Amino acid sequence: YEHVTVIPNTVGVPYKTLVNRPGYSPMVLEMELQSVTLEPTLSLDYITCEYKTVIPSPYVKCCGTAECKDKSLPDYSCKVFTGVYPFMWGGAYCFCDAENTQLSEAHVEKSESCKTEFASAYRAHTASASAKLRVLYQGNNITVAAYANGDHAVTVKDAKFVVGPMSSAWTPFDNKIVVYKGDVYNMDYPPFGAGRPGQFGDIQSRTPESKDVYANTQLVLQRPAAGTVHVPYSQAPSGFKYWLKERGASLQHTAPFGCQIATNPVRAVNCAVGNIPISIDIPDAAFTRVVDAPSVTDMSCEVPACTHSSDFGGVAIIKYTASKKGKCAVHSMTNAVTIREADVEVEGNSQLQISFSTALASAEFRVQVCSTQVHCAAACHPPKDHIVNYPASHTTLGVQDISTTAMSWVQKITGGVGLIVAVAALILIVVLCVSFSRH
Amino acid sequence: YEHVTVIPNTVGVPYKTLVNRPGYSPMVLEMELQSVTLEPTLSLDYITCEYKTVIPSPYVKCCGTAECKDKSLPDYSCKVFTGVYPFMWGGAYCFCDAENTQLSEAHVEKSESCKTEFASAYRAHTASASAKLRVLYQGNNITVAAYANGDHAVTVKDAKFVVGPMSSAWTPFDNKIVVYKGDVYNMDYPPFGAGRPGQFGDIQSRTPESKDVYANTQLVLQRPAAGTVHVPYSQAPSGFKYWLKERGASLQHTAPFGCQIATNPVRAVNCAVGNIPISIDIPDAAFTRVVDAPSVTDMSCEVPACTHSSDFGGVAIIKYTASKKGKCAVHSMTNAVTIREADVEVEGNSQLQISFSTALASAEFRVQVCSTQVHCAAACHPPKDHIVNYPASHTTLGVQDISTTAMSWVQKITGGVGLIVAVAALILIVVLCVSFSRH
Numbered sequence: 001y002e003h004v005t006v007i008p009n010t011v012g013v014p015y016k017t018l019v020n021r022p023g024y025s026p027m028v029l030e031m032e033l034q035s036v037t038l039e040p041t042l043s044l045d046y047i048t049c050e051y052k053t054v055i056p057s058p059y060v061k062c063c064g065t066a067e068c069k070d071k072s073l074p075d076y077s078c079k080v081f082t083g084v085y086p087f088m089w090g091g092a093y094c095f096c097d098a099e100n101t102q103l104s105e106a107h108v109e110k111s112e113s114c115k116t117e118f119a120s121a122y123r124a125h126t127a128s129a130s131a132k133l134r135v136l137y138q139g140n141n142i143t144v145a146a147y148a149n150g151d152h153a154v155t156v157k158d159a160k161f162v163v164g165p166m167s168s169a170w171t172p173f174d175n176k177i178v179v180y181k182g183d184v185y186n187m188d189y190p191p192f193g194a195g196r197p198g199q200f201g202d203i204q205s206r207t208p209e210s211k212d213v214y215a216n217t218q219l220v221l222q223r224p225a226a227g228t229v230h231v232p233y234s235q236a237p238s239g240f241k242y243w244l245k246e247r248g249a250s251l252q253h254t255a256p257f258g259c260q261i262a263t264n265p266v267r268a269v270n271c272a273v274g275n276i277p278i279s280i281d282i283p284d285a286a287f288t289r290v291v292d293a294p295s296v297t298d299m300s301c302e303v304p305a306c307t308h309s310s311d312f313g314g315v316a317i318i319k320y321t322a323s324k325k326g327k328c329a330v331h332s333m334t335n336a337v338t339i340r341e342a343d344v345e346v347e348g349n350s351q352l353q354i355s356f357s358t359a360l361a362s363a364e365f366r367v368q369v370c371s372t373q374v375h376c377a378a379a380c381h382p383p384k385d386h387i388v389n390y391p392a393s394h395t396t397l398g399v400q401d402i403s404t405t406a407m408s409w410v411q412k413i414t415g416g417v418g419l420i421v422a423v424a425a426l427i428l429i430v431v432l433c434v435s436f437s438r439h
Numbered sequence: 440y441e442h443v444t445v446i447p448n449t450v451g452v453p454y455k456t457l458v459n460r461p462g463y464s465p466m467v468l469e470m471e472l473q474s475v476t477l478e479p480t481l482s483l484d485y486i487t488c489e490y491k492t493v494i495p496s497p498y499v500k501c502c503g504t505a506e507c508k509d510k511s512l513p514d515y516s517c518k519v520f521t522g523v524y525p526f527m528w529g530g531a532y533c534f535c536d537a538e539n540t541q542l543s544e545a546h547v548e549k550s551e552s553c554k555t556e557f558a559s560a561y562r563a564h565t566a567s568a569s570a571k572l573r574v575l576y577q578g579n580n581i582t583v584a585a586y587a588n589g590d591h592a593v594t595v596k597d598a599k600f601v602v603g604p605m606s607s608a609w610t611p612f613d614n615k616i617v618v619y620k621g622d623v624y625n626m627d628y629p630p631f632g633a634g635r636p637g638q639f640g641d642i643q644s645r646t647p648e649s650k651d652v653y654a655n656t657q658l659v660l661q662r663p664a665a666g667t668v669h670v671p672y673s674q675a676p677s678g679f680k681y682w683l684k685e686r687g688a689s690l691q692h693t694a695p696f697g698c699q700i701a702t703n704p705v706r707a708v709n710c711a712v713g714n715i716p717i718s719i720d721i722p723d724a725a726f727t728r729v730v731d732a733p734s735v736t737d738m739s740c741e742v743p744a745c746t747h748s749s750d751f752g753g754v755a756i757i758k759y760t761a762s763k764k765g766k767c768a769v770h771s772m773t774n775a776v777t778i779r780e781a782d783v784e785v786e787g788n789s790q791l792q793i794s795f796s797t798a799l800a801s802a803e804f805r806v807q808v809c810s811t812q813v814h815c816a817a818a819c820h821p822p823k824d825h826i827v828n829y830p831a832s833h834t835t836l837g838v839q840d841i842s843t844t845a846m847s848w849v850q851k852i853t854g855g856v857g858l859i860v861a862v863a864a865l866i867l868i869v870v871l872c873v874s875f876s877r878h
């Protein structure tokens with residue numbers, strides 16, 4: 001047998017789905033979402049890290065002049081100066097008072113630290129869904145894992161489960177993302193080869209190991225301090241290290257629906273959006289012919305007390321009589337109320353208690369068991385607490401709601417005098433019809 | 440200086456782009472598309488290959504009966520039979536004439552050949568673009584490679600090139616694709632775990648090395664032939680090997696726009712769709728002040744003959760006079776005609792010849808050189824050939840076209856008698872206005 005259902009995309013909220021098959025006892029299964037993972041694409045746009053500035057020993061000269069020869073290196077720069085008269089510990093370096101010259105040059109390279117610490121920019125666009133389910137089958141909890149895209153089919157305990165596809169294509173991610181060691185950020189990185197100094201992307205590297213790099217750091221030299229031998233540099237401050245200082249809030253806090261985000265691999269998990277379709281092919285072995293199930297008769301219901309709450313605040317006692325000892329499923333056919341229990345053993349002329357959750361001020365509903373219906377009417381009361389920690393979406397109430405006793409009040413209010421006014425209009429128009437024929 | 444242009448997405452067709460800068464001699468660059476590669480996503484849905492059927496030695500028994508014990512193996516099957524009296528070379532296996540029994544069983548596993556030969560199904564959805572360009576710069580052809588998505592920037596010979604993004608998002612691929620050793624097919628494979636026997640996907644494996652597999656082969660046993668010892672099997676024929684027999688046309692022939700398809704990695708290349716935007720930042724070093732360029736004067740044009748064709752069938756001779764020896768660019772400002780040459784050396788009061796392509800029956804156009812314009816009028820003739828092999832899109836002609844001498848004819852035809860009829864109407868209405876005042 002094949003059964004298809006749909007459930008809200010929520011985690012930790014048990015769901016009852018009643019599959020019925022003529023000629024056999026109908027059975028209701030409990031399905032729970034352990035977690036749902038969304039794996040986005042991974043197109044590594046590039047990486048970046050802190051840079052090291054290499055400035056070899058400056059070239060000094062006397063009574064002669066140096067010269068700049070271009071170097072095919074990133075952001076390589078050079079300069080010359082004249083008239084410098086450096087002094088060392090033992091005295092002047094050389095005699096030429098002003099005929100001397102100084103040549104300096106520098107460049108910037110990647111740091112070995114990049115091999116361990118860095119920030120990587122990807123252009124992830126799409127994603128795939130995988131999920132974990134817990135199912136109450138034959139009186140035991142069973143775990144299943146499958147891709148929640150409507151394609152993956154999984155066989156367990158002789159039954160075939162298919163999940164997905166996700167109703168909503170929404171994702172918390174973005175086309176372009178930047179990832180640190182364990183943090184993710186939605187942020188539009190500058191295009192490769194156009195890094196703006198002092199900002200993210202100031203140095204661009206294709207891979208942590210690729211020797212080729214790109215840089216933009218305005219490396220300008222300056223005239224050295226008089227009387228000293230040294231190289232000054234106007235090295236641009238590293239925007240990469242700085243961006244780590246102003247990273248801002250991570251996406252695990254800014255993600256709508258709070259989809260928890262992990263790494264290695266990067267996934268977004270546990271966000272409630274849309275719903276999921278599930279198709280279950282269940283072999284008939286689990287199915288039991290109706291004759292096998294014990295009968296039921298003399299059904300009475302009572303509610304000693306009930307309390308509409310996020311928990312199972314409602315308790316109902318039912319008196320039942322059955323043919324023989326045996327298991328029997330229990331369900332509520334009204335979505336406004338949910339029942340924690342799935343089935344129960346029935347011996348005969350006995351009673352039982354059931355714990356349920358509702359949201360109506362007055363709970364008036366039918367309950368199905370052993371292919372029989374029993375009414376239940378009660379007046380719940382508001383609990384004391386206004387907010388709770390654990391989640392509970394079972395007790396969902398639409399705009400339609402039970403006015404309870406006040407229902408009668410509005411039923412009494414609905415009475416109007418339109419009938420009498422129409423009667424008066426008819427009477428006047430007829431008594432006029434003596435003179436009013438067809439106008 | 441920054442210049443932005445757009446060119447049709449075509450390969451092998453040179454394109455002239457004239458960048459002009461006041462205060463310097465304008466320069467026209469030739470850009471050609473070597474190839475454009477589209478790399479689609481790669482999400483390996485699964486793989487498949489031929490399967491091997493393992494049927495160990497059947498269990499024989501006499502005067503007793505065997506039994507089937509379930510095996511947690513793919514498509515494992517078993518059966519028993521009674522009354523079989525097998526015979527071997529030396530005589531009957533055993534005495535029990537009919538009390539004997541036979542137990543048989545079999546299963547199906549992956550083949551070691553899968554490690555070498557197989558077919559892999561992917562769910563590639565999106566793609567990225569990379570391209571190769573040839574540019575005529577400073578009188579030399581230079582090659583550039585970059586991602587054609589409007590992001591990658593490439594520095595060459597002191598100039599910054601940016602290409603893309605692709606105007607059209609169209610692709611020849613599809614969300615779901617199946618790849619053989621060197622062939623690709625657009626084909627919707629069945630979902631994993633639901634392989635239909637005798638068709639592609641009949642056996643499903645997550646990876647070539649993963650031990651776990653899924654199968655669907657209706658392995659039913661049969662009663663062995665009387666008087667013999669052997670195992671019959673109703674093994675399902677392998678749909679995988681068969682699909683190789685009816686693969687059909689590959690996508691390299693069915694792809695619109697003929698985008699050539701490769702593998703390892705899978706790319707679609709050389710398909711003309713849409714256009715490409717290109718932004719070039721050119722340092723002023725290449726730019727030359729107008730005063731540097733020699734002047735030009737006494738410009739005359741003549742066409743000894745021309746022939747509108749896919750080739751450079753037009754030849755034009757120009758008499759020119761210049762101030763001094765020097766290079767000078769040449770261009771045509773009308774898109775209806777293209778010129779093969781980019782620049783030329785000019786010595787002074789001399790002449791030159793230029794080879795060009797057109798599509799107008801009568802070619803009437805201006806030509807720009809050394810910031811000066813020269814007219815050129817000629818009457819081309821149709822060539823003899825009706826179809827050619829090499830591609831040529833330069834000579835593009837819109838609905839607007841030169842009627843040539845016949846233009847005058849229609850200009851003569853345009854004359855109408857509406858003027859005289861309006862004159863007659865005015866005359867009659869006025870001579871009536873004696874009695875017609877304002878109606």
Ligand SMILES: *[C@@H]1O[C@H](CO)[C@@H](O)[C@H](O)[C@H]1NC(C)=O
Pocket residue numbers: 136139140141
């Ligand atoms: C299934 O999970 C519930 C959750 O609390 C647990 O109480 C129960 O013992 C588990 N096993 C069953 C229902 O067989």
Ligand SMILES: *[C@@H]1O[C@H](CO)[C@@H](O)[C@H](O)[C@H]1NC(C)=O
Pocket residue numbers: 575578579580
């Ligand atoms: C550039 O390519 C053309 C193509 O044929 C070739 O003729 C020419 O020699 C190449 N080099 C140039 C134009 O410097």
